[PDB]
Structure formats: structure tokens, C-alpha cells
Design a protein around this ligand. Structure first.
Ligand SMILES: C=C(/N=C/c1c(COP(=O)(O)O)cnc(C)c1O)C(=O)O
Ligand SMILES: C=C(/N=C/c1c(COP(=O)(O)O)cnc(C)c1O)C(=O)O
Lengths: 312, 312
């Protein structure tokens, strides 16, 4: 069919079997780089806007606000352009140059926040922006807005179910807001009724989900896996549906993304490398050796040319 | 389904209706940025390799060669990585930095040629590379290889036919090798039997198709519309199925691509701006006012961050 604007064209991303990871093809990746603005967040950029329209919090003349590590911002930006809204976004200054320049090209009022404060800083700035003029702005707050996991429950999850003919046994996803792993897991476990293993991935440098579940002190840290590991437990992470948490270090994340490019011909972003490295570890345990593992690859390589991903 | 490697996932790109171009939605764009390596050329990178495999000119141990303005090279590069081939590519040194760095990341032996000589120079270099060791190399020669238009006849054309429910009246495409407009036109005109208007787009700065058809002296020239306007009539341009040639200047191409981003939320590359500008002109002629115009958008914005596309 013909989509009325770019926001309606979200999803229907392909599954590709990996040849140099996993064990005899038990690792398959979902290429979320193939989306309107080339990341998984295109889905929530669209649905958060649609939902706010539906419940009347977003109207003509209202200006969108949120905090992002980049991809959600780019997602909200193309949707704002497509559907006719002004938009302000906060983002840590340390995020990739590509994110900054693309946001500006999409017509965003971009507010860069202090690198040291990370997402908490960007979230804080967005809140004080909106508080300065509540009638002008609407913050869509991706870290707690239920419209985030809901679109993954409605689209991403069902796509996985259909394309695997219900054979998916494991889903592996890095956690930023938690929306992807949450919505996908609810779809497959609750809507299709299959008791899969849901695997959250986080940086070993900032393993706050692992620490939380272990009853240890939460100690966030710096890392290079752009897009995940926000340093706190986000509201859109449904801890209750997470069966397993896997930690991955930055170096191995980067090396794995380079391997995906050079060995599989898959133009993956950094967090895609982290997710596949975690999946590869599970895939080579005899307990998962004959299970079908589906891995979310959130973004594409060219959004990271200015990062350590293209070191060398 | 689950694709055995990334090359099999080509195509099935969406149609999106434009809101600020054309006349009441008679202009619809096909987003070829949504492909394995994020351009229309993913299709021919895959099929040229497959076809050479099938007729035995590409075997294990043979090294791929071709000349490119970038996207075909990136396309052949991911396919080479996915299917296990070494690859050398020539490309004019003046092409976008993103093309260079991505090719290197995909493991290409990249040979940059003199900017002044353009594609003719890159083609010349590829030929002398292969001639130095014919048993080592196979040049896939996208400018004359029939496997280029054939995959557009098999996939791109049929997709357009299906998604428009056979209502497509006009197809607008920039010409580099000519493969896209050729294969699409053959599918719709000859396979589905509908007498559409096929519109080739070229730079006004290098209007060699227009000059040729007019019986005027062919006078190529420099321009900024990366990917089209190679300065000669390529063998994969079937002049016989071209009903109309539209010329577009570089400035207007760039401005139109920026508009696509800022006003439609479509992350288009430069040649995408040229194609839409040509389509917009046809769309506002009463003779096409109630005809459905489908426009190929060959690539995505982030492949052009280092170009004039992000001037300002
Ligand atoms: C929070 C965002 N990051 C999402 C993200 C994620 C995590 O997705 P969830 O937010 O759904 O957990 C993984 N990989 C990349 C590259 C990402 O950009 C954001 O773009 O603002
Ligand atoms: C010749 C190539 N350029 C194809 C191309 C085209 C033209 O497609 P055809 O080769 O099918 O004519 C249009 N726009 C962009 C950005 C392109 O890269 C190449 O990548 O080597």
C-alpha cells in the first residue's frame, strides 16, 4: 500500500541468519536499521506521537519535548516534520556527531546537555524546559511513556512471531528505556502464549539491572555502548518479564559490530554488537544449542562513523 | 521468513505519499534507503553476485572488481562479506567521505581515482586492474551487466505494481547506470502491460541523455548530484523505453532533499532531491495532475553528512 506519511511505514524489518556467530544458525538478527529514520526507535517516535494525538495532549501549536541518546530524538524529529509539529530535544553532548547533525537537518531545537550527567542530565533538562512553559510543551517521556513498549507489543513482537513461524525460543535485546524487550516479551509470552527466554543486555561497566536483581548496590558507570546502559532502572523496563540479564563490555561490543560488518555484511551499530555478543554466548551453551535465538539490532553503522566503531 | 544471508533480504521497500510536493498526493516516493546496505544498489549488488555465481564466472578464490560512485560498491561489499569473497572497487576520490569509510569498514580493497576523470576514470582503472591478472579478478561491470536491470525488472518494478494496485502512471528515476529506470520500465510496460510514462532524470549541468535524443553534441559537465549524471550514455540505459527526460540543477536537487527531510520527515540523499524536483514539475502540469507518479529515492541522508547536503 501507500503510506499517508513516513510515520505509518514503521516496522516489518527482516530476520537474517548469522553464519559466523551462534551454533549452526540458531542466532538470527532483526535489522531495525531498516526503518523510516533507520532505527528501532522509529516505531516509538511514531506511536508516542499518535497516542498523544489520540488522548489530546498533543495538538497543533503544542511543541514536542523529550530526552534522548539520539535515535528516539531522530525518530520523533522525522515524525514531527511529517505531521507538522515543532520539537525540542535534549541529548548528552557526548553522543555521536551524526545524531547531532541529523537532528539539526530535521529542524530540531537541539539542547545538548553535560556529558558527565548522561541521560539523567538530559531527562532533567527536558523537565525544566517543559516546566518553564507547560502550556507550550508536551514531554513524551520515552523512559516511562507506555506508548513506547505498546508499539513493540503491537508490531515488533508479532513480526518476530510471524517470521519465525512461532519457533522463536529466546529474545535478546539491549536495554535503554526497556521498551523493546518489554513490549516484545509481552507479545510473545502473553499474546501468543509461548514461554520464551527474555534476555536483557547491559554494559558490564554499568550493570545496574544485574546488581538490582542480585540485591547488590547499584553502581552505574561510563561505557561506549551508545543507546543502552542509562545507569538506572527505567520505568519502561518490565523487570518481571526478564528471565536473564547478560553483561557485555564496550571493547567486545565494538569488535562484534565490526565483525558483523566485515564477516556477515550487516551494517550494525554499536549496541547491535553488544546484543549479538550476548546472544553468541547463550547460543554456544548446550542448553540453547537447538533453540532459536532472535536478536534485536537497534541501529545502523553510518550513525557511528565519528565513534570508536570506525577506529582504524 | 528468515533470510540465509543479508543479500536475500533486498527490496520490499515502502511507498510514501508526499504532502508538500505534487498535487493532492499524486507524488509517491519509493524509499530505497530501506535496504540491506541502505540504497537501491543493494539489489544489484546481490543479483550481480548471484548471477556470476550461476554462470560460473564467480567462484571461491575469485576476487570481485567494479567501478562505483559509492552505493554499488557498498552494495557489492556487504554481499562479498556475507558470501565470502574478496573485493576491489574503484571510485572517484571526490565521492562522499561516508562512502569511503564504510567501504573500508566492510573490508574492501578501495582504489580512489582522479576526481577530474569521474566515472570514466573509475571504470578505466577497474579494467586495467582486471587486465593485470584476469584469472584472479572478475569485473561485474554494473554499467553494462544485464543482471543490473534484470533484478529491477524482477523486484523493484513488481513491488511498484503491487503497492499501487496497478495504478502507477509515471515512474521518475535519476540515471547513473540506467538499470533502475530500465528494469522498472520493462516490468511495468512489458510484463504487466501498462503504458506508463518513464522519466529519466539527469543534471542540467551534464544533460547527455537530453542532448543525445535531441541530436545535439554531447557535452558532459561537473555537478553535485552524487550517483547520477555519469557524463555518457550507459549501456544499461534502455533509451527505447524512456518517454521523457527531465533535467534538474544541483542547487535545486540539494534544496529539495533538505525539504524532504525538514518538511516530509524523509531522510533522502541528494539524487533523491533531484528525482522529486523533476517529479514535482510533472505533477503540477494539468496533464499529470490526476496521474499517479512514483519516484525512486535511491539513498539516505547520513551517507551525505560530509557533502553540501548538510551545508549550514
Ligand atoms: C533511549 C534511546 N536509545 C534506545 C536504544 C536501544 C534500546 O532500546 P530500548 O530503549 O527499547 O530499550 C538500543 N540501541 C540503541 C542504539 C538505542 O538507541 C534513545 O534513542 O533515546
Ligand atoms: C552508479 C551508481 N550510482 C547509482 C545511483 C543512482 C542511479 O541508479 P541507476 O544506476 O540505476 O541508474 C541514483 N542515485 C544514487 C544515489 C545512486 O548511487 C553507483 O553506486 O556506483
Amino acid at each position: 500500500a501507500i503510506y499517508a506519511d513516513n510515520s505509518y511505514s514503521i516496522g516489518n524489518t527482516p530476520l537474517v541468519r548469522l553464519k559466523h556467530f551462534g551454533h549452526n544458525g540458531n542466532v538470527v538478527v532483526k535489522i531495525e536499521g531498516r526503518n523510516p529514520s533507520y532505527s528501532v526507535k522509529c516505531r516509538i517516535g511514531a506511536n508516542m506521537v499518535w497516542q498523544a494525538e489520540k488522548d489530546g495532549t498533543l495538538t497543533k501549536g503544542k511543541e514536542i519535548v523529550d530526552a534522548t541518546s539520539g535515535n528516539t530524538g531522530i525518530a520523533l524529529a522525522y515524525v514531527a516534520a511529517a505531521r507538522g509539529y515543532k520539537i525540542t530535544l535534549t541529548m548528552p553532548e557526548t553522543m555521536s556527531l551524526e545524531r547531532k547533525r541529523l537532528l539539526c537537518g530535521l529542524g530540531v531545537n537541539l539542547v545538548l546537555t553535560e556529558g558527565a550527567k548522561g541521560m539523567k542530565g538530559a531527562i532533567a533538562k527536558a523537565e525544566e524546559i517543559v516546566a518553564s512553559d507547560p502550556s507550550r510543551y508536551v514531554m513524551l517521556k520515552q523512559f516511562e511513556n507506555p506508548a513506547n513498549p505498546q508499539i513493540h507489543r503491537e508490531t515488533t513482537g508479532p513480526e518476530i512471531w510471524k517470521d519465525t513461524d512461532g519457533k522463536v525460543d529466546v529474545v535478546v535485546a539491549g536495554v535503554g528505556t526497556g521498551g523493546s524487550i518489554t513490549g516484545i516479551s509481552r507479545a510473545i509470552k502473553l499474546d501468543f502464549g509461548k514461554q520464551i527466554t527474555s534476555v536483557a543486555v547491559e554494559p558490564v561497566e554499568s550493570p545496574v539491572i544485574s546488581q538490582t536483581l542480585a540485591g547488590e548496590e547499584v553502581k552505574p558507570g561510563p561505557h561506549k555502548i551508545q543507546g543502552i546502559g542509562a545507569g538506572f532502572i527505567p520505568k519502561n523496563l518490565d523487570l518481571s518479564i526478564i528471565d536473564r540479564v547478560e553483561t557485555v563490555d564496550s571493547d567486545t561490543a565494538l569488535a562484534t559490530a565490526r565483525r558483523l560488518m566485515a564477516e556477515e555484511g550487516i551494517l550494525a551499530g554499536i549496541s547491535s554488537g553488544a546484543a549479538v555478543a550476548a546472544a553468541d554466548r547463550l547460543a554456544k551453551l548446550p542448553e540453547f544449542a537447538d533453540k532459536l535465538i532472535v536478536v534485536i539490532l537497534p541501529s545502523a553503522s553510518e550513525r557511528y562513523l565519528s565513534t570508536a566503531l570506525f577506529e582504524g
